[PDB]
Amino acid sequence: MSKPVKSKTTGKNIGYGKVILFGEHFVVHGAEAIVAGISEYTECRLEINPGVPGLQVDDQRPAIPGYIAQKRDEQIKAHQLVLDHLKVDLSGDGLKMFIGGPLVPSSGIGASASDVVAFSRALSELYQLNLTDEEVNLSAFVGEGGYHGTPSGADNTAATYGGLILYRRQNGKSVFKPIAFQQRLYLVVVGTGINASTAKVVNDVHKMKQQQPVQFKRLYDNYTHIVSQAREALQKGDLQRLGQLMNANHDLCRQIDVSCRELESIVQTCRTYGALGAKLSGTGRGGIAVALAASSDQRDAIVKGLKAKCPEAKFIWRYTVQPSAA
């Protein structure tokens, strides 16, 4: 068992949020996906709790209403998975856990991964485990097993590493590599307030493929062209084109029946107010959408326009993706 070396963490142990820029659903069928680990993060602080067994959680994240209550049981399992994985024993002296950071937990933003990532990092600090990024990512992956199934890996990987990430099922598992990019991405992410079941939607997509092998294959190849071009746009630093491609991607998502009225309303208003591109992000049929802005100022216009004109935009967040290099 790991014995605690420090009495209190003093570092900044965080896990980044996540949005899928390209390729939700199509990735299941072998397409490349672009996932963005955002700057906005969840932080975990730990200290010893002498004489008091177990893990005391003081969850102060700015989560949407009801989110923390509704995820608590899964969180309990998630945290215990990480403790067991890291060989941490809280049966004598326990730990007080404070959870913070500016990330807003809500369906679609990868918050559960940000949680287990931040936790793994703080444990590494307190127990002086010197976890590598790979080791943290695995710990997060194990812990993500405590939230409702199933982890592909993209959420923990974005939360651990941040930045842009190429995500594909290769050769027969999830494969991830970083994407070099020299420009800030100014994002508006919007929550619908509607919860979707990944497993259920993904299986609906499988069924459509079984019912329409030739049509599906058409949409799938249509996708592969967009992502190819998206990679180009990024290497060039061409954000207008990147935005147009996001629009094209949303269009394809509508054609596999994973959008909804609320998502459509949001994306229409984002484009109206000058988004370079806008699309559902992740599972669809609820959850979040993401818009790309050309600057911080034009983001102010999109947020203003959503608030005045789109009642379906229940929660509006300004998030950013950091450039990998100068």
Author numbering: 1 to 326
Article sentences:
MK catalyzes the fourth step in the MVA pathway, the transfer of the ATP γ-phosphoryl onto (R)-MVA to give (R)-MVA 5-phosphate. The enzyme is, along with galactokinase (GK), homoserine kinase (HSK), MK and PMK, a founding member of the GHMP kinase superfamily. LmMK exhibits the characteristic GHMP kinase fold consisting of two domains. High-resolution crystal structures of LmMK are reported and provide, for the first time, insight into the binding of substrate by any MK.
Recombinant LmMK and a selenomethionine (SeMet) derivative produced ordered, isomorphous monoclinic crystals and a single-wavelength anomalous dispersion (SAD) experiment provided initial phase information to solve the structure. The SAD approach was required because molecular replacement calculations using known MK structures failed. Although the non-hydrolysable ATP analogue adenosine 5'-(β,γ-imido) triphosphate (AMPPNP) and (R/S)-MVA were included in crystallization solutions there was no indication of ordered ligand binding. There are two molecules in the asymmetric unit (A and B) related by a non-crystallographic (NCS) two-fold axis of symmetry and the surface area between the two is 930 Å2 per molecule, only 6% of the total surface area of the protein. Such a low value is consistent with results from gel filtration and ultracentrifugation experiments that indicate LmMK is a monomer in solution. Molecules A and B overlay with an r.m.s.d. of 1.2 Å for all atoms. Molecule A of LmMK binds the substrate and overlays on the apo-enzyme molecule A with an r.m.s.d. of 0.7 Å for all atoms. This indicates that there no large-scale conformational changes result from substrate binding and the molecules are so similar that it is only necessary to detail molecule A. The replacement of the insert and two helical segments in the rat enzyme with the short loop connecting β3-α2 in LmMK results in a polypeptide conformation, not observed in structures of GHMP kinases, that lies across and restricts access to the ATP binding cavity.
